[PDB]
Symmetry: C2
Subunit: 90 residues, 2 copies
């Protein structure tokens, strides 16, 4: 769920050719001849999880610390981004 307007260059003209080609196959609008795509062209991006970052409060040796951890979704590898303390309780 992210939106934007994109320019109407060659990539967008190729999108219009595909749509007219596909509609000609369906036939519900006769035989159509592609002319051009005009402004505006709106584009939605659908996302998927690449990775994560966690911010923790962690007790260690009865003292409280802040830690940031990063995690890859595919390999599940983790990195310590930050570790400091003692910090006051939240």
């Amino acid at each position: 769920g992210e939106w934007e307007i994109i320019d109407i260059g060659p990539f967008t003209q190729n999108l219009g050719k595909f749509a007219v080609d596909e509609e000609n196959k369906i036939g519900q609008y006769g035989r159509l001849t592609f002319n051009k795509v005009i402004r505006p062209c709106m584009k939605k991006t659908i996302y998927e999880d690449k990775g994560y970052e966690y911010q923790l409060y962690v007790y260690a040796s009865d003292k409280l610390f802040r830690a940031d951890i990063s995690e890859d979704y595919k390999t599940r590898g983790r990195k310590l981004l930050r570790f400091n303390g003692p910090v006051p309780p939240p």
Copy 2:
């Protein structure tokens, strides 16, 4: 990105074990003994493009149509999601 609060169950406790284990390797706070992860725990999600949807105004046979096209990022299959018209110029 996108942010959320998560529960502090076994997955979050193991996040704290990782952070303390890694900090012990660095050594700046001496030898630390993991106790627990406490509230609150915040989680950020990093996103990658899964696919797209394009909303076009396209001239075909000198008539103006609205068309929506989807596009999968990895397999690159495109699909015609909608095609109607004539529509008034935007």
